């Protein structure tokens, strides 16, 4: 064989170019930096009103608006300062797996097992919430709607491919293929020109939203990646598996910077979020509780433990003022 | 201390709360049934026989059933099945014709063993009965399952297969298996589902009280 020999030596000698220039681990340098102690965060607000499991949640762009999508076919927009429900949207499918908020507060996208990413319009002339555009064209279940502008959004699916759509015409503007499993998550970059996606073949991959280019591939887990988010400066991204491992990969160093597992952990991570300073890498677990990990020393600097079922969604605001968590017991609890 | 507009906002929030509670109640009186089975197992036959994800809503004897079919899953990684907790029962369909039987057996073991489906009864169906014998005559369970040593007739072999699937149940203390054999042509496939969900619910109610 010739191309198999060339591909084998390509992967092994590019890994050798990575290893020969790999100076040291992230902890070997940050070891002398002092820890942050125990971040005992308290439940300030306890949003109630959902009567089924809560599957996803997105903050507003003004650190006050909020969306929560539940299993009983309800999408609720919360005022998170007075615990008031701003809006309640009936959902064509009770099989809601993900939801998103527009960065201008105008639209809200929500989708799931019916392969259709619905996009709703809140700022109407009639005072109700009508469905603006149902993006259809996926062959399987949907995950991680993520708004770029009011006319642009990337949606992951179980068709081993993600898709950049165009809300005006309604077509699949850009198609990102290259996975060998069901892409469970994606997270938009803070500059909104790149994104990363994690799939059920134990491997993430950094994609460019402009050219549809497979820029980088990430590996290191043994099981599927269930959720993903970016370091707030857009140069590193931490994922969370069912391996009970959160991992931090650098987009430029091409390998995992460091692992965020503990031996006492029995079950896998469901959600991953970053504080605004990039110093508290939160992680919701299936053990009914989330762990706020110190993102430089990998020590659990606090445990948010108020839910009665498995944590399903985390969200830190744009200023970092709060941590909304949502679980299968129908309760979002804000922690400050 | 509320401003003139916060008072109307709080009134709207309370009205939204009322609507959410009253629609939840309506959504909690509905029987959720997951539909599983291997390919060409009559999933398609049962959904038509029955009165992305495809939901079939039907009312039977005052019970409103939402039967959710997830066969259309492009790749069954099944990291989405946990979404089907709470479902009253998992209707699993198998066909004697399709050793596709050994495929159905491994699937049945998988569904019963789940940490998510340990309390949920399973309604297993062998609905069709018009082509389940004409093959037995020419070939019993010896060709697919070597271990069988019983009479190569319909009743004996069918009962043995049923028992061998039932044998897959690894904890009979919490869940039960309700098996069906009567021909699909008779319109009793739904009636059997109705009896089983009634039983599942009666037992769930008495088990909470502590009587069970």
């Amino acid at each position: 064989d010739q191309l198999r020999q060339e591909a084998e030596q390509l992967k092994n000698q590019i890994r050798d170019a990575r290893k020969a220039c790999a100076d040291a681990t992230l902890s070997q340098i940050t070891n002398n930096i002092d820890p942050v102690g125990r971040i005992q965060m308290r439940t300030r607000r306890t949003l109630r009103g959902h009567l089924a499991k809560i599957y996803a949640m997105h903050w507003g762009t003004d650190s006050r608006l909020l969306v929560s999508a539940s299993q009983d076919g309800k999408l609720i927009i919360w005022d998170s300062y007075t615990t008031n429900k701003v809006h309640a949207i009936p959902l064509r499918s009770s099989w809601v797996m993900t939801c998103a908020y527009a960065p201008s507060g105008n639209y809200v996208a929500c989708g799931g097992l019916d392969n259709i990413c619905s996009i709703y319009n809140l700022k109407t002339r009639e005072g109700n919430v009508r469905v603006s555009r149902e993006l259809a064209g996926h062959t399987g279940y949907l995950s991680c709607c993520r708004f770029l502008d009011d006319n642009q959004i990337v949606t992951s699916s179980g068709d081993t491919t993600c898709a950049l759509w165009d809300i005006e015409t309604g077509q699949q503007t850009t198609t990102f293929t290259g996975h060998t499993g069901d892409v469970m998550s994606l997270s938009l970059a803070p500059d909104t020109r790149l994104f990363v996606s994690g799939a059920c073949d134990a491997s993430a991959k950094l994609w460019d939203v402009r050219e549809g280019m497979c820029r980088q591939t990430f590996t290191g887990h043994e099981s599927d990646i269930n959720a993903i988010c970016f370091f707030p400066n857009g140069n590193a991204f931490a994922t969370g598996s069912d391996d009970a491992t959160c991992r931090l990969f650098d987009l430029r160093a091409d390998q995992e910077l460091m692992t965020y597992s503990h031996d006492n952990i029995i079950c896998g991570i469901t959600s991953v979020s970053f504080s605004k300073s990039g110093r508290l890498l939160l992680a919701g677990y299936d053990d009914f509780n989330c762990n706020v990990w110190d993102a430089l020393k990998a020590d659990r600097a606090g445990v948010l433990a108020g839910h009665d079922n498995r944590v399903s969604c985390l969200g830190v605001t744009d200023d970092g003022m709060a941590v909304a968590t949502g679980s299968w017991d129908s309760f979002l609890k804000i922690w400050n | 201390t509320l401003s003139a507009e916060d008072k109307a906002a709080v009134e709207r929030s309370k009205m939204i709360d009322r609507n959410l509670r009253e629609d939840g109640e309506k959504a909690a009186r509905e029987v959720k049934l997951l539909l599983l089975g291997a390919g060409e197992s009559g999933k398609s036959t049962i959904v038509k026989q029955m009165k992305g994800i495809v939901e079939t809503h039907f009312t039977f004897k005052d019970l409103h059933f939402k039967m959710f079919d997830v066969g259309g899953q492009r790749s069954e990684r099944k990291k989405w099945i946990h979404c089907f907790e709470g479902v009253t029962a998992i209707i699993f369909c198998v066909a004697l014709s399709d050793n596709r039987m050994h495929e159905s057996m491994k699937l049945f073991d998988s569904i019963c063993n789940n940490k998510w489906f340990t309390d949920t009864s399973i309604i297993l169906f062998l609905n069709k009965k018009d082509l389940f014998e004409e093959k037995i005559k020419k070939s019993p369970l010896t060709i697919c399952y070597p271990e069988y040593a019983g009479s190569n007739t319909y009743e004996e072999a069918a009962a043995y297969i049923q028992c061998q699937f039932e044998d897959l149940n690894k904890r009979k203390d919490t869940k039960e298996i309700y098996t069906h054999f009567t021909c699909a042509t008779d319109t009793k496939n739904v009636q059997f589902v109705f009896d089983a969900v009634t039983d599942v619910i009666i037992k769930n109610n008495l088990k909470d009280c502590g009587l069970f």
Epitope: R64, D79, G127 | A4, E5, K7, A8, A9, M15
Partner: single-chain antibody
Framework: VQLVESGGGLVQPGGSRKLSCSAS????????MHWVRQAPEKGLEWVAY????????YYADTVKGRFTISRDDPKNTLFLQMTSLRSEDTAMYYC??????????????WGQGTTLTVSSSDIVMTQATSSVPVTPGESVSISCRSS???????????LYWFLQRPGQSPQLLIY???NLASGVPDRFSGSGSGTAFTLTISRLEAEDVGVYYC?????????FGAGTKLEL
């Protein structure tokens, strides 16, 4: 959207008139409804208010207990039943919709108004003039003053700038001191602080002419300004 009223006409004093506000084109059961009035060539004056679901009902202290408010939500018909009418109740009555949530424009669409003619503490808002002559192409500044500071502890300054073109109904321009309305030309801008409030209109056109108005929402009873009229 089409709000349209009826029940206007001439009445002798001592009688009892009644007005209906038929709505066509929106969700009337999700909107609070104000009744506003305007005396002939004098200015606007708020009358009454009824929050969604008929819960909160407020009146102006001039006719508090002398009028009554009725509402039909599965029929979309809003009623004002006036019990005794003096020679001050004669006015053009308007029926305004108002939705209250975080970020709404709660004085957006005004009804066409109806004429009613009778034969013969509170915040004061003052407007500086009654007539300003100007030509098109000239940027104009209007100003009005309030008694209390309209800046609440929320940060919201509940001041509203309306415009009434001659022969028409009023139209919301600013709903929160410095917030434009739904589809008004971006030529207009509002600014000011606590008590002094100025509306700047750059690139004035021919249609911009009409009686402008400033109104506080901070306190019920809602009190309107005197009314600056742009002249051309």
């Amino acid at each position: 959207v089409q709000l349209v009223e009826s029940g206007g006409g001439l009445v002798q004093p001592g009688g009892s008139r009644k007005l209906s506000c038929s709505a066509s084109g929106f969700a009337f059961s999700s909107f609070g409804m104000h009744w506003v009035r305007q005396a002939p060539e004098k200015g606007l004056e708020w009358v009454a208010y009824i929050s969604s679901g008929s819960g909160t009902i407020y009146y102006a202290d001039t006719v508090k207990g002398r009028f009554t408010i009725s509402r039909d939500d599965p029929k979309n018909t809003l009623f004002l039943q006036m019990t005794s009418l003096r020679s001050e109740d004669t006015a053009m009555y308007y029926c305004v919709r108002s939705i209250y949530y975080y970020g709404s424009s709660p004085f957006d669409f005004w009804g066409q108004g109806t004429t009613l003619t009778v034969s013969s503490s509170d915040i004061v808002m003052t407007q500086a003039t009654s007539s300003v002559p100007v030509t098109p192409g000239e940027s104009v500044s209007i100003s009005c003053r309030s008694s209390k500071s309209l800046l609440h502890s929320n940060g919201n300054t509940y001041l509203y700038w309306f415009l009434q073109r001659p022969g028409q109904s009023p139209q919301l321009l600013i709903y929160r001191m410095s917030n434009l309305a739904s589809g008004v030309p971006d030529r207009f801008s509002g600014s000011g602080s606590g008590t002094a409030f100025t509306l700047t209109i750059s690139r004035l056109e021919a249609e911009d002419v009409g009686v402008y108005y400033c109104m506080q929402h901070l306190e019920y009873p809602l009190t309107f300004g005197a009314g600056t009229k742009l002249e051309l």
